[PDB]
A paper describes a structure:
Using both theoretical and experimental approaches we studied in detail TrmD-Tm1570—a fusion between TrmD and Tm1570 proteins found in 66 organisms. Within the PF01746 family, there is a well-studied TrmD protein that modifies the N1 position of G37 in tRNA. In the PF01746-PF09936 architecture, TrmD is fused with Tm1570. The Tm1570 protein belongs to the SAM-dependent RNA MT family (Pfam ID: PF09936).
Our theoretical and experimental analysis shows that the CnTrmD-Tm1570 protein functions as a homodimer, unlike other double knotted proteins we study here. Therefore, we used AlphaFold Multimer to model the structure and obtained a compact homodimeric complex with the main interchain interactions present between the corresponding domains. Both of the domains interact in a standard fashion (antiparallel for TrmD and perpendicular for Tm1570) with their counterparts from the other chain. Herein, based on our analysis of structure and sequence, we found that deep trefoil knots provide the binding sites for SAM in both the TrmD and Tm1570 domains of the fusion. Based on C. nitroreducens we established that the protein is a homodimer capable of binding four ligands (S-adenosylmethionine)—one in each knotted binding site, and a single tRNA molecule (based on the similarities with HiTrmD). The SGHH motif (residues 198–201 in HiTrmD) that interacts with G37 in the substrate tRNAs for the methylation process is present in SGNH form in the C. nitroreducens fusion. With respect to the native C. nitroreducens tRNA Leu (CAG) substrate, the TrmD domain retained 86% ± 4% activity of the fusion protein, while Tm1570 retained only 18% ± 9%. These data clearly demonstrate that the enzymatic activity of the fusion TrmD-Tm1570 protein towards tRNA Leu (CAG) substrate is governed by the TrmD domain. However, based on structural similarities, we believe that it also acts as a tRNA MT, probably by modifying 2’O in ribose. Our model and the crystal structure are similar, in particular, both of them show “open” domain organization that enables homodimer formation.
Author numbering:
A (entry chain A): -2 to 430
B (entry chain B): 0 to 241, 247 to 312, 328 to 429
């Protein structure tokens, strides 16, 4: 809103707060009137010779807890002068992050309540707190350092508090990423040279180098942040180049077969390749780290059609038209037979896959996906069918058959594309667990 | 052996002033530990005591120079073994586990940056590790250093007394702590829990453990999942923790590749494929939502032809009124997207808050514009697999989320 930002800090150590804000860029912001820090001496709101703000807690022992009355009066006094937003600093509160700093920025007046000893009588917290905030997943002796750290993080977002020396718009966490490294003179320090692109490169080379190192530092140190970052197309392509070739504990392959399938009467048939099975299943397989998606069809003309599609997205204009479809088709292989799939996997893994077929129908001795990680020290090949599904010969050749996907009731006639997506999600969630 | 914490900073007196207050200052006075601020400007050559300079690669951002920090750390190491921590957002997120690990050192040196940060060559040459105080940015490392020192020094035996014991605390236990109260017994009509006034020790212990588990479950459920619970703790949790679905496929307002708002055309297979997934998983109705009359006519012709439950309609508002008529109550509106949104929720969180019919919204094109995501009551966490690629078709996302919802009730 329209008022200068003001941060009131209720504390038994008000001069600790004053002293902290004499230093650094924030003290300059205070000096020229961009915000204000207002320490409130909690002992002022007492009426005994000891200026008592704490007492022995209920429940036994001699642990000390801050009393409700002084804190209540201190907050009531502020509210009597101005509207304020009341934050109790407490390990039980929201873990403070950059998103918290950006949210708290919108208030014009915030009051931070600092406890000491065991904590604060929870009645005045329930009565007066607008929220609780924790500075982190650890414990400190008092809220004072939590308060000034939050004030620092919030006040440095006030326009004009910072300037050229360090901008708040491109920074770790603010961007959803960890920042790239920084360097200054000299060009070489104890044999360690500043990256040459930063010395003699053009603007675009520098930007690309910085973006790459940021994504790399984030992937390596805080992969959890990658999952929460909405990556641009450029950032995604950098990420893929960094994860390419990383081996996981599990090597899963998917094959979509078109022979031998059943017709409506159970006779053996060869099916045509459905264009969307190429698109949809290649993207599911890539999402779940499948090592290769095999498209198996014994008819030369079907393979030629499918290979042309893949080439359009890998080497033709599709590669520019939709980069993530290219990325997914990079792992798709058009081939003629299950024997070819097995020999290809044997070449890639130096071991024969365990072959697992799929069906909507009941099969004796069918397994659940939990069995898969039991045996995932070897390559796993999941077989999916087309038409009316696999003939019985394939279900018997396979090493295992997965239990069918069911929901509620009898109807479970999913597209093969939906069945692939479900089984891969189940496998991924099982292995994480 | 007394613990020593050296802080390399351009503001040495800030460090000295901070440690005059509170229980930590008494611990310093009797020799339980010691904080030694190091003036980084003492390790400069010029008249201006220069510790920073403009960075390579453009602009006017200031970066801490490598040489002063190098000389400051080398000077310390020439006199005693020390463990060197660079304070940096890119480091290990500081937690109670971190504090307990750092406690084992007898001498730690904290390096505080200012402005854009520290020349990374001296970090590579001299850091033993990097530590971040949290997932946020502050103007300098000084407050991060003193906050870490506070957290570590208070685990030194004798620093704390009976005022507050460090053995049973939030995070140290893997849980959040129970509430605390002191005199008076009643404050503005609020009575202290009577068990704490007139209960026996076992009753007080049970109440505290239950409120702690209750608080942890409600505020930090992630902490519950990480904790190896006692048999008693797991029984308490159990006692604390002891649905019609609709699906709409929307074609406005969606992003195109450039992020502009568009209406998409119907994709024929979205009609058959998503129908079969909804029918498999007991969805009450599948709504196909498109504001263009010609697209609605196409969808109706595809459905009549495809067969030789699914409702073609014009707007989200029409879907909502339709469900309100069927269920005699408004649904909770849940949007889906591959992009993580703040406060997005899991399928497991959805099951716990679903006391009304649920409408799941699925997009087309390049997905929902942000305005839809903000209007929805909740947005689901994105589907992820290996974590570097999650561009699924809408048909596959429907299948996955419905299977997850089905399995959460099994
Ligand atoms: C030793 S703490 C008491 C913590 C409490 N016994 C617990 O375990 O949850 C004393 C005061 O320091 C502050 N404090 C300690 N850790 C904090 C954190 N992580 N976030 C915010 N404030 C904290 C609080 O204001 C608290 O009242
Ligand atoms: C259109 S379905 C044919 C359904 C046939 N009744 C069958 O054997 O599953 C084509 C392929 O999708 C997969 N599929 C479809 N529904 C499935 C389900 N409910 N459980 C497991 N796989 C399924 C199977 O791979 C099947 O070969
Ligand atoms: C404004 S920060 C520079 C941050 C850097 N530009 C970035 O975005 O990652 C200046 C100094 O404050 C300290 N600092 C800022 N945030 C920190 C954090 N989360 N953890 C530890 N130190 C931090 C660091 O010592 C840093 O060198
Ligand atoms: C083809 S996607 C649109 C583009 C998509 N937002 C992307 O970046 O990949 C069509 C719809 O499928 C759903 N969807 C696709 N991938 C998803 C994912 N990974 N997580 C959640 N929903 C997803 C969303 O409802 C989305 O609106
Ligand atoms: Cl004071
Ligand atoms: Cl074959
Ligand atoms: Cl100073
Ligand atoms: Cl989920
Ligand atoms: Mg920056
Ligand atoms: Mg405690």
């Amino acid at each position: 809103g329209p008022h200068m930002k003001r941060y009131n800090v209720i504390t038994i150590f008000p001069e600790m707060i004053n002293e902290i804000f004499k230093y650094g860029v924030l003290s300059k912001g205070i000096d020229i009137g961009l915000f204000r820090v207002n320490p409130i001496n909690l002992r002022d709101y007492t009426e005994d010779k000891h200026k008592t703000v704490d007492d022995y807690q209920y429940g036994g022992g001699h642990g000390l807890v801050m009393k409700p009355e002084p804190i209540y009066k201190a907050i009531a006094d502020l509210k009597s002068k101005k509207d304020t937003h009341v934050v109790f600093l407490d390990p039980r509160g929201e873990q403070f992050t950059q998103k918290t700093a950006e949210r708290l920025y919108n208030y014009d007046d915030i009051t931070f309540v600092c406890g000491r000893y065991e904590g604060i009588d929870d009645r005045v917290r329930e009565l007066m707190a607008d929220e609780m905030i924790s500075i982190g997943d650890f414990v400190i002796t008092g809220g004072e350092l939590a308060a000034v750290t939050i004030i620092d993080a919030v006040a440095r977002l006030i326009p004009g508090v910072l300037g050229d020396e360090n901008s708040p718009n491109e920074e770790s966490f603010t961007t959803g990423l960890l920042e790239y490294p920084h360097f200054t003179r000299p060009a070489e320090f104890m044999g360690k040279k500043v990256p040459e692109v930063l010395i003699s490169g053009n603007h675009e080379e520098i930007r690309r180098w910085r973006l790459t190192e940021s994504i790399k530092t984030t992937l390596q140190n805080r992969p959890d942040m990658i999952l929460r970052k909405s990556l641009s197309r450029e950032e995604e392509q950098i990420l893929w180049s960094l994860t390419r070739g990383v081996q996981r504990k599990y090597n899963i392959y998917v094959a979509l077969m078109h022979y031998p399938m059943r017709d409506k009467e159970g006779k053996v048939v060869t099916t045509s390749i459905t264009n969307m099975d190429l698109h949809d299943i290649s993207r599911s397989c890539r999402t779940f780290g499948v090592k290769n998606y095999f498209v198996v069809n014994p008819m030369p003309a079907q393979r030629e059609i499918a290979s042309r599609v893949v080439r359009h997205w890998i080497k033709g204009y599709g590669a520019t038209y939709n980069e993530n479809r290219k990325e997914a088709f990079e792992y798709t292989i058009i081939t003629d037979s299950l024997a070819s799939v097995i020999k290809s996997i044997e070449e890639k893994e130096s071991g024969s896959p365990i072959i697992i077929a799929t069906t909507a129908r009941y099969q004796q001795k069918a397994i659940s996906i939990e069995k898969l990680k039991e045996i995932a020290d070897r390559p796993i090949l999941l077989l999916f069918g087309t038409g009316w599904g696999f003939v019985d010969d394939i279900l018997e050749f396979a090493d295992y058959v997965l239990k069918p996907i069911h929901g509620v009731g009898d109807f479970n006639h999913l597209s093969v594309r939906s069945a692939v997506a479900i089984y891969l999600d189940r496998i991924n969630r099982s292995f994480q667990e």
